[PDB]
Ligand binder design. Structure first.
Ligand SMILES: *[C@@H]1O[C@H](CO)[C@@H](O)[C@H](O)[C@H]1NC(C)=O
Ligand SMILES: *[C@@H]1O[C@H](CO)[C@@H](O)[C@H](O)[C@H]1NC(C)=O
Ligand SMILES: *[C@@H]1O[C@H](CO)[C@@H](O)[C@H](O)[C@H]1NC(C)=O
Ligand SMILES: *[C@@H]1O[C@H](CO)[C@@H](O)[C@H](O)[C@H]1NC(C)=O
Ligand SMILES: *[C@@H]1O[C@H](CO)[C@@H](O)[C@H](O)[C@H]1NC(C)=O
Ligand SMILES: *[C@@H]1O[C@H](CO)[C@@H](O)[C@H](O)[C@H]1NC(C)=O
Ligand SMILES: *[C@@H]1O[C@H](CO)[C@@H](O)[C@H](O)[C@H]1NC(C)=O
Ligand SMILES: *[C@@H]1O[C@H](CO)[C@@H](O)[C@H](O)[C@H]1NC(C)=O
Ligand SMILES: *[C@@H]1O[C@H](CO)[C@@H](O)[C@H](O)[C@H]1NC(C)=O
Ligand SMILES: *[C@@H]1O[C@H](CO)[C@@H](O)[C@H](O)[C@H]1NC(C)=O
Ligand SMILES: *[C@@H]1O[C@H](CO)[C@@H](O)[C@H](O)[C@H]1NC(C)=O
Ligand SMILES: *[C@@H]1O[C@H](CO)[C@@H](O)[C@H](O)[C@H]1NC(C)=O
Ligand SMILES: *[C@@H]1O[C@H](CO)[C@@H](O)[C@H](O)[C@H]1NC(C)=O
Ligand SMILES: *[C@@H]1O[C@H](CO)[C@@H](O)[C@H](O)[C@H]1NC(C)=O
Ligand SMILES: *[C@@H]1O[C@H](CO)[C@@H](O)[C@H](O)[C@H]1NC(C)=O
Ligand SMILES: *[C@@H]1O[C@H](CO)[C@@H](O)[C@H](O)[C@H]1NC(C)=O
Ligand SMILES: *[C@@H]1O[C@H](CO)[C@@H](O)[C@H](O)[C@H]1NC(C)=O
Lengths: 823, 16, 24, 823, 16, 24, 18, 24, 18, 24
């Protein structure tokens, strides 16, 4: 809708609540609002008042030591968009040290344009982790929310579910909650930044956040770009001018604000490019009749004066004060203590300056990576100097790698010396390149630039070592390179070789295990020169590695340290045959099949093509064919470095002193299977209850002939059948003429393995169980069984067969009456 | 460190 | 006298083609 | 004996062999002999000449690039003692770069008094490691023999054995050899430094090395202290004076050497304390009539001039040139590149100086530990200064800990500034203490002393943290201390606790695993103050540890870094009960005993008092008493950090900026055994072939009641006996009146465990083997065995007993004829 | 790290 | 709710006598 | 009379002119 | 400001009378 | 014409005036 | 000496004529 309320420039509230009563008819705030230091308050003093008309904060909102407020939604239930023209240590919402605050309640926010949110040190705060800040803010990695009750403890966040949308923040769909009875509004992604209505329809293109009617420029709650009489517009039409990047004013408003500073004590407003601007930039001037920035002839810059010479740049709210400057009166002390990348906002704020009268000092900055945000820095004058006569000071910059890019950039340092200490990713070649570009070569004294602190973590050796002769094997690499000599050859201590395995190609520079190399012996001729190399040994087959060679040297401060290094190249082992396929286990379900299970071996060696599984039926043992198991013995198997640096320099010092003192001037086809892409194989079509020979090989190459591994041997046996050992067929008798019974039966032709014994349980009626053992040779001798010398009567003969697996089934009792020779 | 036939494999490889 | 000195005591590379140039 | 030869002052031999012919009648050498740079020589040029008369070298012997000499024994076969008045980079025997030299041959040396021996870069040298240098030299750790053929290769040192004495150097008695046919002479230890003769008898007290007659002052080969006309003397009697600490000369020799310098161009000799000395020391002067050092009145010092202002001290041969000086004209650049402790020889040479006109500069010295060898250093003038206006320069001193001891020592620095860089065992408290003693407080500029390089490896925090409240447990320690605050309390980041186990008491300062401690919360009152502490957890029982706590702080260069630390105290865990005694194995030799073997458990927990071994006889199972094993089923068992530092300083910088912006001005007794001090125990007196319950406990405390560990359970069974399962006694029969045989026998009363079956193998004559099974309940039912319904005839009954162990022995065949009822 | 009854043994030991 | 948070997640010391002062 | 930083600065400065 | 008066250095009471006007 | 240090100094200086 | 002429710096030939008198 429209804006019911007055313009309301930003005031400051302190120590009693009477000046909070001036926010009745306020729709927007042009400025910052700081509700701070509220000591003699109660929770009964805050719930009886509300200001629901307020919609927009331009600069920031600050809360600092306010007692008794348990949620801020009693104050501001309709705060929509925080803009962020001026900031507060690059934040627009600082909530610091709230005692007796438990929840936020700020449900009507979904966009803050420029800045971040830092909430800390609230000792009773909950509902912090249940807000998805990714749809609230743009740079969501510059948030800093820590040290509250919601991360120290595990207070219960009661969420309204039975309705809130469940979004993701790391891996889980948890509901987005503000209070116990207010959901967080999440628009669909077709409404990108324009917002959605209550039914989820996208609003107008100049709407922002909330609209009562979708695709309506008159019904936006907050304008996105500019405001003119209830109509959100992308730009101001003439004669309306832009004002503070949020609204359209006319000529009389900027003229009256010019007259309220010209006839008073301030920001005397001008106009340029149809925008009511505080000051004219460089090349422009101020008239008397009209307020326009007409072009000033000649060199006519913007000159900004610093307060007492020094300005300490610490954040964006100090960087934005020097916006549009070209000539700096004094010295800049850039000290950004950070952890977040602030180079883009410092690029957008600074970089329009040309000349610095004092000195540029960088000190203790962690989060900078370059000093190229000064896009237009030409002349450092050094009229006011750092004590020690330095026009440039660089101490303890942790991640500073490059000063500038010297393909295009250039700097003219007039007076003063140079200073460099504790810059571990910065190199002396870059320091000497800035010394050659700036022309300050013979100006500083010795030990103004540090020699051992700089570049100790960055590999900037600035020489290339070409790998000359590389040959591979199964698990050994012959590495070679061209020989390099520093011009005192005894300062070369050897080669500092580094190795690592490489699953990828984007291996980082500078784990990372090490071997050390003896230096070569030169023969002072260029004929052979003894290309040094290293025989690399003890590797893994079919593994890409990461090989680079750095030169280990001896420091001398009259020159540089020294430097030569090689690029991180990769080498491939290719191999021939893999290792033993392990885990031999033999599972045999049923009687005609055996499944096989195994693990892959330790060498993949390229593609696992197939597993070469061999099987062949092993015959039974010869010694169990003839052994009498009716005899006794019937058991059958049921089947430091610096000391070495000092030693090398001690040898060089002794050769130095000795030369100074002395020289003075005056088949068989087994059944096998190509088992592709499976760790299991059923081997069916078998003989039941016999041994098998199982040979397993891991073949890494199939098509340009079969290369297979060394074999693994295991044996197996199936389960016995049910009726293989059961005696089938009737048992017939041959009763002889002298009471001799000769027994004929049909033996099992294909039993479980073999049957070693035939037990006979024969029972006369009126008698007990009598036993007689029939072995295999007893069966072959008597073609069955023979009974000799027995009592007359009717018998009941049951015969079981005892196999290698065990007993079979008993036969039926054959009733026969032998001759009594009495009756 | 290489005890075995990796030495005679290694001075196959250093001498080609 | 190289096989007890190029196992686990660990050794360099120059004596290997020096022994190769001594054998041939 | 005597000295046949002339005095022979030391000459220098170069490039041709004609000046080596002047050493014919030379017994001693007063000076140094340098045989160097011998290019056009052959081995045929050296074997035809010998100088066997030479006995003594005073200063040193130097060899440098001499070709063709394969052993030096052709030159000097009788060189005895190298003295070492003047040195050569603190050596007296430098053998450098001998080509075609294979062995030394210097068998007649056994004492060199002052200095060391450095032999290197001889490409064919052997017989190096077969010389025991411990009886040759005094400071044998300052030897440097490396990079020859005797350590690169394995050349055969042929030793004369069949005779050389085999002494020790690290652990082995190898023979001490010089050549292939010369042994090394080792005296017995009663001859301490006087030496022995050929039969091993000790010589005179003024003898040295070798004597022809033992306990004879006239028969010494070399004098120990002084020489006078064939008599080795301890001191020179009057009127003979001492000369060069080796011989006695008279007044006319020192007077003639005075006249050979006064009437010539030099070392004009004087006399003092009956010694012919080159120059008079401080407080003395020179007359005209007599040559004595009469006492000079007033302040009359020795003033030494340096060549062009700077003198570079590098070794003892440069330190000995400034002997006896008091006033130094210029600057001393002490640069000792070392690895050996040279503080005692620099103490004996320097330290007599009082005033230095220039500057004292220490640079890159590794082997110094203190700068207290200047015992008399008072005034550093600084008239000639180091560029940068420094009168003191200290760069890259690696092991320099103390400048001086300020309980006694004091230094007055007049002009010039101070400088300190890269001294990692040196502290800013010691630098500021030298600043307070020397009075150079407000003289140097800022960053003349480094702040982060100094003391980074040395714990010199200079504050004490008292451990307040220590309680122990089984494996947990409650550690506590008094709280410490740096005066900005947010700079305290926490406590940097270090822990290590301690088997000894002399645990070194600064492995060494780590846990980090959160800082305490102060409540701004001195009533309770919250003594921070740490609950130390997860330890080993009965283990002395090493606990000290260091404070982790934040750097600020306007003050010091910060410092507080605790002493390395020790704590004792004492424990209650040990762990499980592992490795349960049961070995049972014979039938009446079982031995037990076990390993000690993981907790010793003090004294292992005894192993509580319990044994009790477990009875047999009830279910095997009644089961019919004659039925089917007869199977029986046969029995980084800097990001967190930046985060803390970022929080402090945000609180800094917020306060700056806001605040503006206007039982049952089992048989057991106390098994002391043995891991084996035999348990005898047993029942044979039964199970036992074995309970083993590890008792760490016996006398103030029994504290024992948690038990370990294992079971065992003995071997069976031979005749326990053998059936003893005859087998008698009861033939009934209807051909029923009832069999009586005597059962085994105490068998191996139990007997489950009684097998009966009965054979009629003319028949085969017939089987009948008798179980235990069959035996109890029939009180033996009963046979019913059998054929008449004589039988042969053999009965075996099958036990839990197995079969016993068969009984005798009982021949009985049952009634036929036919004849 | 102490899963078990070493926690209740530990807050016997911190609270005497 | 302390026994799953002072095992292998590892925890500090202040909550232990805070729970001891909450129990007594 | 120590150094007053942090929350003790505002906690002691509140007791100055209450 | 306030921090270089009463955090780096020693603070008196009459300058806290002067400096509590931001509260007043 | 390089730098001449070590044993190459005396080995090249011997070939100067032989 | 010799080392600061012809090891740290570049050496000419006529100073080696001057400096080989220790050989000569
Ligand atoms: C706060 O109270 C004082 C009187 O104690 C009064 O003078 C002052 O005006 C009040 N503040 C505001 C903002 O009204
Ligand atoms: C809001 O409206 C009332 C009614 O006219 C008026 O008195 C009051 O001053 C207005 N509020 C503001 C802040 O102007
Ligand atoms: C959007 O605005 C309308 C009126 O302008 C209001 O009634 C409604 O509650 C708002 N909704 C949200 C989610 O802000
Ligand atoms: C802007 O326009 C209105 C009417 O169009 C009139 O009051 C005047 O021209 C301007 N007002 C102000 C406050 O500048
Ligand atoms: C700012 O610098 C310019 C450079 O020439 C100088 O002329 C001017 O006086 C300076 N202004 C102040 C206020 O220092
Ligand atoms: C400095 O740089 C700009 C562009 O980077 C270039 O145009 C200009 O010529 C340079 N100045 C000089 C003196 O070369
Ligand atoms: C035995 O295993 C194989 C492998 O899965 C299966 O195909 C077969 O049906 C199984 N046979 C029986 C009788 O379980
Ligand atoms: C196996 O072969 C396929 C194509 O033939 C390839 O995509 C795959 O990466 C190979 N896998 C391995 C482990 O070599
Ligand atoms: C070496 O030979 C030269 C002639 O070549 C001669 O002048 C010189 O005297 C000889 N050296 C000695 C020490 O005799
Ligand atoms: C050694 O004695 C001979 C014989 O008198 C003499 O000529 C020679 O010069 C003596 N040697 C020396 C070095 O004086
Ligand atoms: C060599 O002689 C000196 C003379 O005092 C003696 O101190 C030293 O111990 C002797 N050395 C040996 C190894 O006997
Ligand atoms: C000791 O001296 C005598 C004569 O002085 C000599 O014959 C003997 O060989 C010497 N022995 C040794 C071991 O030096
Ligand atoms: C030392 O004494 C001898 C005789 O005793 C005599 O030549 C003279 O007095 C002195 N000789 C020398 C060379 O000084
Ligand atoms: C050595 O120092 C003293 C100190 O006063 C001075 O008088 C003398 O002239 C100096 N001598 C030389 C040669 O520099
Ligand atoms: C300097 O030290 C000595 C002893 O170390 C002492 O006697 C003397 O008094 C000291 N000098 C001063 C001025 O105290
Ligand atoms: C069985 O072992 C014990 C333990 O050493 C031994 O004393 C005993 O003699 C042994 N008995 C036989 C029969 O080996
Ligand atoms: C066991 O006790 C003896 C004396 O009773 C003692 O010397 C020894 O150190 C103790 N050993 C252990 C491991 O406690």
């Amino acid at each position: 809708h429209l804006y019911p309320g007055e313009v309301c420039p930003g005031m400051d509230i302190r120590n009693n609540l009477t000046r909070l009563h001036e926010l009745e008819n306020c729709s927007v705030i042009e400025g910052h609002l700081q509700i701070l230091l509220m000591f003699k308050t109660r929770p009964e003093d805050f719930r009886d008042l509300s200001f629901p008309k307020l919609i927009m904060i331009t600069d920031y909102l600050l809360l600092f030591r306010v007692y008794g407020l348990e949620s801020l939604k009693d104050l501001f239930p309709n705060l929509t968009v925080i803009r962020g023209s001026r900031l507060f240590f690059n934040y627009a919402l600082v909530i610091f040290e709230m005692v007796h605050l438990k929840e936020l309640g700020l449900y009507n926010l979904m966009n803050i344009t420029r800045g971040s949110v830092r909430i800390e040190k609230n000792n009773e705060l909950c509902y912090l982790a249940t807000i998805d800040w990714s749809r609230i803010l743009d740079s969501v990695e510059d948030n800093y929310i820590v040290l509250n009750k919601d991360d120290n403890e595990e207070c219960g966040d009661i969420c309204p579910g039975t309705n809130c949308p469940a979004t993701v923040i790391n891996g889980q769909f948890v509901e987005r909650c503000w209070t116990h009875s207010h959901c967080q509004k999440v628009c669909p992604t077709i409404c990108k930044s324009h917002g959605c209505t209550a039914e989820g329809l996208c609003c107008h293109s100049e709407c922002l956040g909330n609209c009562s009617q979708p695709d309506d420029p008159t019904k936006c709650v907050a304008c996105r770009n500019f405001y003119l009489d209830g109509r959100c517009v992308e730009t101001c039409p003439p004669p309306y001018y832009h004002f503070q990047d949020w609204r359209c004013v006319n000529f009389s408003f900027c003229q009256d604000l010019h007259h309220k500073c010209k006839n008073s004590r301030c920001h005397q407003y001008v106009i340029h490019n149809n925008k009511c601007i505080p000051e004219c930039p460089s090349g422009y001037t101020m008239n008397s009749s009209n307020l326009l920035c007409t072009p000033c002839l000649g060199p006519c810059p913007k000159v900004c004066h610093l307060l007492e010479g020094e300005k300490t740049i610490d954040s964006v709210t100090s960087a934005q004060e020097l916006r549009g400057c070209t000539v700096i009166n004094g010295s800049l002390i850039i000290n950004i203590r950070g952890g977040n990348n602030l180079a883009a906002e410092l690029e957008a704020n600074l970089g329009l300056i040309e000349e610095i009268s004092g000195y540029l000092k960088i000190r203790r900055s962690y989060a900078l990576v370059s000093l190229s945000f000064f896009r237009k820095l030409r002349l450092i004058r050094g009229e006011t100097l750092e004590i020690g006569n330095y026009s440039f000071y660089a101490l303890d910059n942790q991640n500073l790698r490059q000063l500038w890019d010297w393909s295009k950039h250039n700097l003219t340092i007039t007076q003063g010396k140079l200073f460099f200490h504790y810059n571990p990713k910065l190199c002396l070649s870059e320091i000497h390149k800035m010394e050659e570009v700036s022309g300050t070569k013979g100006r500083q004294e010795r030990n103004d630039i540090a020699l051992k602190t700089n570049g100790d973590q960055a590999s900037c050796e600035n020489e290339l070592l070409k790998f000359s002769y590389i040959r591979t094997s199964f698990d050994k690499i012959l590495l070679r390179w061209e020989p390099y000599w520093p011009p005192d050859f005894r300062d070369l201590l050897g080669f500092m070789l580094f190795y690592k395995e490489a699953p990828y190609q984007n291996v980082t520079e500078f784990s990372w295990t090490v071997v050390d190399i003896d230096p070569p012996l030169r023969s002072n001729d260029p004929k052979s020169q003894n290309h040094p190399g290293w025989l690399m040994r003890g590797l893994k087959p079919w593994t890409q590695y990461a090989i680079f060679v750095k030169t280990l040297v001896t420091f001398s401060d009259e020159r540089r340290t020294y430097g030569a290094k090689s690029d991180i190249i990769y080498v491939q082992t290719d191999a021939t045959n893999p290792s033993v396929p392990l885990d031999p286990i033999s599972v045999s379900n049923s009687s005609s099949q055996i499944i096989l299970k195994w693990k892959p071996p330790s060498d993949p060696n390229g593609n696992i093509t197939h597993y070469l599984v061999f099987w062949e039926r092993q015959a039974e043992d010869s010694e169990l064919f003839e052994l009498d198991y009716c005899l006794k013995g019937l058991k059958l198997p049921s089947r430091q470095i610096l000391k070495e640096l000092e030693e090398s320099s001690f040898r060089k010092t002794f050769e130095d002193y000795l030369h100074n003192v002395v020289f003075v001037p005056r088949e068989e086809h087994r059944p096998f299977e190509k088992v592709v892409n499976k760790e299991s194989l059923v081997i069916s079509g078998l003989r039941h209850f016999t041994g098998y020979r199982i040979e397993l090989q891991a073949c890494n190459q199939d098509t340009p002939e079969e290369r297979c591994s060394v074999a693994a041997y295991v044996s197996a046996r199936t389960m016995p059948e049910a009726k293989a050992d059961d005696i089938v067929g009737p048992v017939t008798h041959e009763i002889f003429e002298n009471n001799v019974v000769h027994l004929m039966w049909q033996e099992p032709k294909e039993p479980n393995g073999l049957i070693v014994l035939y037990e006979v349980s024969y029972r006369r009626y009126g008698d007990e169980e009598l036993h007689l053992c029939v072995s295999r040779k007893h069966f072959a001798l008597e073609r069955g069984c023979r009974l000799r010398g027995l009592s007359p009567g009717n018998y009941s003969v049951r015969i079981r067969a005892t196999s290698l697996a065990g007993n079979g089934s008993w036969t039926e009792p054959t009733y026969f009456y032998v001759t009594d020779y009495l009756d | 460190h290489l005890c075995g036939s990796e030495l005679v494999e290694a001075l196959y490889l250093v001498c080609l | 006298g190289i096989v007890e000195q190029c196992c686990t005591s660990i050794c360099s590379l120059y004596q290997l083609e020096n022994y190769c140039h001594s054998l041939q």
